[PDB]
Amino acid sequence: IFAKEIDLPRNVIQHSGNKFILDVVPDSRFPTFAITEFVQRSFSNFTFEQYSYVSPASLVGYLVYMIHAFVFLVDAFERSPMSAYASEIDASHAYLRIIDAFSDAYIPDFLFEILDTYLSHRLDIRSKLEMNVSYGSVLYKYDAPRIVAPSIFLLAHNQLISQSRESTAYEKWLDSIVIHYSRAVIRVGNLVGGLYQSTHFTYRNWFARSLSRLADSATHRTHLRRPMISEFDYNIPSVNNNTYNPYVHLLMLEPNNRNITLDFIRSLSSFCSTELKATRTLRDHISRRSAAISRCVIKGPEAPTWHSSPLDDLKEKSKQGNFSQFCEVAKFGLPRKENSESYTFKFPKDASTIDTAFYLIQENGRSSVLDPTTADEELHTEGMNLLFDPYDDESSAHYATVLSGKLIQNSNIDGETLLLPDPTTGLARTNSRYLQGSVLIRNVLPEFDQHEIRLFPRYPQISRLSASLTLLFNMRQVWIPRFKQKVDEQPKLSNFSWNEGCDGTVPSLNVVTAQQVILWSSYRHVSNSDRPTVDTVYYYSTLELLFGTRSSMMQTYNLHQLLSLH
Amino acid sequence: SGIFAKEIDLPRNVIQHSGNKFILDVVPDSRFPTFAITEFVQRSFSNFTFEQYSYVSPASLVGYLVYMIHAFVFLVDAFERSPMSAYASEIDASHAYLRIIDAFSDAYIPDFLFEILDTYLSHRLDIRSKLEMNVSYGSVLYKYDAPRIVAPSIFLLAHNQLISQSRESTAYEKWLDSIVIHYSRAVIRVGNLVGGLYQTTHFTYRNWFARSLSRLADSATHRTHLRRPMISEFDYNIPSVNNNTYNPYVHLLMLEPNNRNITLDFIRSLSSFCSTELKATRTLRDHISRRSAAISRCVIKGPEAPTWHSSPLDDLKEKSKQGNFSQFCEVAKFGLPRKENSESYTFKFPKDASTIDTAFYLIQENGRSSVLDPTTADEELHTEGMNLLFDPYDDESSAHYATVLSGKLIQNSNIDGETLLLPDPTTGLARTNSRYLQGSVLIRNVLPEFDQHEIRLFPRYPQSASLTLLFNMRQVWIPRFKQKVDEQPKLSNFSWNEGCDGTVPSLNVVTQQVILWSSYRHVSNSDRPTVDTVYYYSTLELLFGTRSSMMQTYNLHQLLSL
Amino acid sequence: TFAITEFVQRSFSNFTFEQYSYVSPASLVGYLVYMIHAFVFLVDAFERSPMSAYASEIDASHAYLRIIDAFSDAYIPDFLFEILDTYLSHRLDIRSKLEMNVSYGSVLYKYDAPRIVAPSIFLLAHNQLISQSRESTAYEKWLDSIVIHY
Amino acid sequence: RPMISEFDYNIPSVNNNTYNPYVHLLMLEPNNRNITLDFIRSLSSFCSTEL
Amino acid sequence: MSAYASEIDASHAYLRIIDAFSDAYIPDFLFEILDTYLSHRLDIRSKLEM
Amino acid sequence: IFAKEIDLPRNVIQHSGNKFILDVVPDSRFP
């Protein structure tokens, strides 16, 4: 009736938002686990006599290699613009020969079940928000054990051949140096979490129990039943913060490794083609597009499968260790430290000269009840996962989600605040609210540095009603009022939530504005096109500020409780 | 379908729970449908026609069409909401008022009003398969919602004023004098609810709602019916309620025990007019069970000036004078400046300042003052503001034609942030999937609009922005330290609100400071609405997401302009 | 209630039924106790001639029609009809105007309160099975739970 | 293994003039109307699916 | 409507004359003139009316 | 080529003008 009079399609302001690239970095421990179990159940059907490099370790390293190769091809040929890590790889003829080698290398149909979840995606209404997979946000002390280096499996190939009749033959593999990171010898036992010291000890977690089968030389007579055999002469690179490129390290593109890398790629591509009946490549697959990248696994506090402690060379035979002595070395779930009492606050001698409710220094009254969660095996190895899906509530589509490695691992964040729309501002700024559920990683504790992890618990959700928190006039900071001497009325101290008894050993505040936050996320954002720094990378603690609470949430087990080792 | 699909077998190793049952109420601001209906009547009703009907006026026809919206809300509440609200339980629908309820269930309505009613249809979310949005007035408190739910009896009073000529006052001014209800000991009038008559002299200011409603009692229409008498007087009786006896379905649908003849005759007499002269063929009965996702579309707006005030009015004996916007906003208590410090309380402070650590003491040396200033009443800023258009499913501006007319709105004046509870994988999936009250404010903290409170508009921050809460989102910790601590704590991580004297907000965290009205609500129990059981949704983006479509448009009085 | 608890303790393992947010042994016992009292209300309000004063006080036509229709169409296991078949109305043969039927329209609280097991007790047990208290068990905090202020 | 949610049940307060067993046993207080309907539907679905 | 047309009352005498010249018969010649006085709204300037 | 990248139907401001009534008063000497 009033359609032509109001004429609202000709009387609106529309803006679809600014351009925003959302980076996805998969935790490669989970596809490595699936690939190792794939090779376990299929390798005896293969003929490897015409190959001097093919072993189970080499085949697992090839498939993990082709995952990282897919990531480089998406970041270099599909992301606009390409990341600063991929721009450092020169387009010279040697690099182009290796890129053409893994662009036409044959991949089995199993690995595309994982790789179809890494396809790019652009939202419908947010038509300038893009999700794509790239390692352009990767720092080594933040992401090193969650990104499985394929050079570990060449060393496992070297140990799988050796004619030794020792009991646990995978322990020389755990000694093998992978990289030098500026002053630091990082071994396989640092990245897989199977060898520590306090005398060397072996801890067999779910990742090392799976990978130890590839480097155990008790079955070396099966792998030596061939005319000609060779070993990988892998050269250990020395990098620092200024020269670390994850694509050069993961794709083995150092100048003293490019011939071995090329022979590795072509030998195992021919092996997959002739024996695994692999017919497909990555070249016709990096331009595909699907909404499966927005599915992720939400985890709580889990124990590491790594530690950053420096290991010496294994001279003797290693003993068997346990969970608690590993978590003391890995610095996970430590108790609350003791008050050293090095600083002293200035409390007045007369107590009637101040209003003591307005003075933040006690008379040594109440102590804190904040205690960290000590490392327990049932809590931190058997915790349940959540399956996130923004578009459909089907559990058959999370088969590839539990294998892929897209995850948000949240330990202590309980709330994220959304900026409410202002109808008086410009609509570009209103429709460009993209960094809402994100934390800048200046505040995020690194996992592969020598830091301590104390798990102060999230509040129990066993209340009777739902809770929320609303911020007035400014959400960017929480006000603490400072009063003048003569005020209008009595200030009521009922809205002040006190954190009684702080002594440097408990959290004093619970607000991170724009060391303290324990978070890893697959979903990231870099604020520029330069080298990723700690001031430019954001970890997304959730995607529900973007996709809503109307999205599907399903609860499941861990992958090692779902995929058995046989 | 996967090498490991049979081994892992996710359909037997996942837990699935859609969440618990949760009903989200929708209370439409019926000023905007009234603004549409008045414009429909002023183009369909000439003063040179329709002279043979005794109860049909522009005023009575607008009142009928406003009545049928509230009738639709009652029918959806009483017959489709599971269970009905306490306000609909108090109606004797089975015996005493069955004739009236059947009268407006079979009353004929023009096809214009179903453009508004198609937006009020019930809706259940897809993945949230136990979250039901439906329209209901079972959350309505009078001092929160009275001027925003336009009472149909106002237009019955306008019809009654169009009959005779008073001493020295116009039909519009005598219509603004007309008492609507006696709420407690107060006398609520049309000039309170429409906002066209304030104060020992009386003044008149036609704001955008009163300027449209003025056409139902203007001088030409009043001169038509004095010089051509046909129209009869409704014998309507004025209700007298309080907090324990108020019911919006009694007041809006005229269901008092002494108004039962009047209401039935009104419904039947204007149903006959709409079926004869307005080609109406459709009723409400087949329409209350229909479902659509149109109820989730809304209009977000910032601080706007009220088209009401709650000051007591005396009887207008003289002729009123001309008023303006600033003098009306002083009476409506909108956009008041910063209050003066009365200095009625004095804190302690040491004569020797080097006995305490001043940076950890919340009382100054009378130093830096607060730079928080309220935004005062500006006509261009508070009447001509821009609106947003929320739609969580589509991206079409043609679909928002009906949501500007519907009145489904969120009017946020000072809230800048809402915190989402993140999912805990170690709790129950029912509790994780039942995060429904995120983005709600309990109305114990919300400033009432039709009580006689004062609205000072401290501004939101000018527009990334992010805030992360650790270990507990329910409260923001303020640390109180031991004397001997491990290391010196960092003072630079504190945000100080300096110079708080009781005239500026001391805190920004709400665990009445909140200035909010929302159409989207939730009631905790099946009882009468209290201030401790009603929530106002300041947003819907915790539920639907920032991937929802947001457009930007003008006010309805700038689209349907005069 | 003693029969229903034994039916639930054999039909509900702690190793199963982990995807439901409101289902417990406690809540299931409370549901099955609720449906007995629901049957008594329906017989009183729709079959006793006339209904009792307690059933006259329920706004069955408008306000509580959704709830009454919810438990009239609620699904009940076949175990509970073994008890409900004994509660059916009966008129004597030669005493053709003496009607026996089930009704709570004679219930005084100080006479009949512990013998009519309130379903909200089991709702309180469900609520106590969620969190851990200071120094008391879930059973003892369930015994502390207030049912009503009479 | 947290999945179970909390019923937000409100405790009734009656006397001799206001006691009704069909209100107390069937949870028909004005503030318990959401809780009762969700309880009945949520356990009817469980009995129809798993029992 | 303009302020000049709003001053004409909708009483029965005025409505009788308005109904008289609303149903008065007009020859086909005068519609050749009156067809040029029809209203018009521009296409792109969709809120300019003549 | 750059149609989906620029996406100019989703990156413009459009306004068709305000309401304006243009009155025509014929010189009746000619009819």
Swiss-Prot record, chain C:
The protein's location, in the record's own words, is:
Virion
What keywords is this UniProt entry annotated with? Capsid protein, Virion
One GO cellular component term of this record is:
viral capsid
Q: Which domain of life is it from?
A: Viruses
> What job does the chain carry out?
The capsid protein self-assembles to form an icosahedral capsid with a T=2 symmetry made of 120 subunits.
Q: Spell out the protein name for this chain.
A: Capsid protein
Q: Which organism is it from?
A: Atkinsonella hypoxylon virus (isolate 2H) (AhV)
Whole sequence portion shown: 102 to 251 of 652
Swiss-Prot record, chain F:
Q: Which domain of life is it from?
A: Viruses
Q: Which residues form a coiled coil?
A: none
Localization terms from the record: Virion
What is the recorded function of this protein according to its Swiss-Prot or TrEMBL entry? The capsid protein self-assembles to form an icosahedral capsid with a T=2 symmetry made of 120 subunits.
Q: What is this protein called?
A: Capsid protein
Q: Which organism is it from?
A: Atkinsonella hypoxylon virus (isolate 2H) (AhV)
Q: Which residues of the full protein are shown?
A: 71 to 101 of 652
